[PDB]
Design a protein around this ligand. Structure first.
Ligand code: A1EKQ
Ligand code: A1EKQ
Ligand code: CL
Ligand code: CL
Ligand code: CL
Ligand code: CL
Ligand code: CL
Ligand code: CL
Ligand code: CL
Ligand code: CL
Lengths: 253, 253
């Protein structure tokens, strides 16, 4: 049974940024605020917003490796509260963040990171002329699964190519997870609806705010190679730590 | 917009116990599993399930005081994963827990607490003859707000009276919180619907499980005294720590 009644129901908004702002205001520690995710079948999962404020030593190893390898002019793509870009800025690198959540951008700015609020496909138009071109793009925090469906992902990758320096790389992490029977049932629903395998349609919920539906996935390295076919990016290497991986994508002409 | 479609929608079940079981299986530490609460207007809040496995030193002070004052035969009413009763059992007391969630009861049992799975009003019928009568009842974890609406609360208090020893006490904690404009709007909806002030109608959500709707409240000490009028329990004392309080209710003939 669905909750809500006309006049007493959740409103479209920025729950992601609201959660981050509450967490920051409380000290940016764990167990202060939680990100809640609802799938389009009503599946509910949550995450502690403190992970967006954790120091480099507490990140998954795939994220640590990406930040240890970053060089040159860096774009932190979907920077959240800025944890990756902030670490690079303190290490002396030229770093810019981009996030679509207005509240997330404000939090990241408050912490000290320059951030453009924009959808990724809008980057070539909204960036200043003096920004970039970028040598390293960060797509961290299951970044490869936040590119969207293959269509959307190739559109984002094309925008990144337009603002990339020759020889640029994407350092993007992802998840290669087993499929429980629950998840297999959802994949059957994807096929009935003519949707790509591996993707879920989810949104964030917080208090009486709901976010817009977006596509999310745990993409294996092999499925990532198929997305890159037709784009200027090549999968160059993959390193694994358990179910996580860090992929290096290399740009060509 | 509501999530879910016929055939791909959440099912009635025991999300509370599912969350506790996942947390225990991971070591019972923080940031493993989260309790997600949905109000009947779609308001979403979450809590870390690790709080149900925390040691006495990490509890709110009102809960610590109640366990420090417990004496005699103890009933832990709504014992969750058993944290309060387990602490008393290790200190040498005769303790029994009661919870309505089958999964919660199993977790508490696995940790070492004797637990009856029952609704509170069923206690006189379901308890063995050799159990009790009880000198101390624990209602901890905003316990006074989990008694339900005044009607339900007086029914529970009557059941506890039937299994109480002469001179028994309830040690019950609660929350005396300010009312934000959001919450004031919900209180106006309560009045439109002929519902008691202070109560919210909520349910738990986890994965594709939903729990039953139940009533929940943050009741001030003065409102608690009104509930007790008509029952054999008297509000004897209140001690405060911030917005939390610990009330001692004393049984009379
Ligand atoms: C992380 N936070 C930082 C400060 C320390 C405390 C903590 C916190 O704020 N909430 C923690 C998180 O879970 C608690 C317990 C939890 O168990 C449920 O099933 C449930 C239903 C809930 C529910 O329906 C509602 C609310 C809160 C609900 C709630 C719960 O909240 C309202 O807030 C909005 C309106 C509404 O409908 C808390 O333990 C209660 N709590 C304890 N101290 C409190 N102080 C104030 N001011 N508000 C509180 O709520 C509160
Ligand atoms: C607390 N846990 C203990 C072990 C360590 C990891 C952690 C954990 O299990 N999930 C953590 C918690 O948030 C993550 C990130 C988070 O961000 C979102 O917006 C979101 C949508 C999600 C979503 O729609 C779905 C799922 C998971 C979603 C999810 C997220 O999950 C599926 O699980 C069910 C089906 C589905 O629709 C995680 O970071 C991803 N993650 C990282 N390692 C993982 N290992 C496996 N086996 N599964 C994972 O998921 C995973
Ligand atoms: Cl988490
Ligand atoms: Cl450099
Ligand atoms: Cl900025
Ligand atoms: Cl596609
Ligand atoms: Cl919590
Ligand atoms: Cl004793
Ligand atoms: Cl038992
Ligand atoms: Cl009532």
């Amino acid at each position: 049974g669905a909750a809500g009644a006309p006049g007493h129901e959740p409103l479209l908004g920025d729950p992601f940024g609201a959660v981050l702002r509450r967490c920051l205001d409380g000290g940016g520690t764990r167990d202060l605020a939680f990100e809640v995710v609802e799938r389009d079948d009503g599946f509910i999962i949550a995450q502690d917003a403190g992970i967006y404020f954790a120091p480099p030593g507490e990140w998954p190893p795939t994220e640590q490796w990406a930040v240890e390898r970053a060089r040159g002019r860096v774009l932190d793509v979907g920077c959240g509260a800025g944890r990756h870009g902030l670490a690079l800025r303190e290490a002396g690198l030229d770093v810019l963040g981009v996030d679509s959540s207005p509240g997330a951008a404000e939090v990241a700015r408050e912490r000290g990171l320059d951030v453009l609020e924009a959808r990724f496909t809008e980057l070539p138009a909204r960036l200043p002329d003096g920004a970039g071109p970028f040598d390293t793009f960060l797509l961290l925090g299951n970044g490869t699964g936040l590119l969207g469906t293959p269509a959307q992902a190739r559109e984002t990758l094309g925008a990144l190519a337009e603002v990339a320096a020759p020889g640029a790389v994407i350092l993007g992490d992802g998840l290669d997870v087993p499929v429980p029977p629950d998840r297999a049932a959802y994949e059957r629903w994807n096929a009935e609806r003519g949707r790509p395998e591996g993707f879920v349609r989810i949104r964030l919920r917080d208090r009486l705010l709901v976010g817009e539906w977006f596509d999310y996935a745990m993409i294996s390295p092999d499925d990532l190679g198929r997305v890159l076919a037709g784009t200027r990016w090549d999968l160059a290497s993959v390193e694994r730590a358990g179910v996580r991986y860090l992929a290096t994508l290399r740009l060509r002409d």
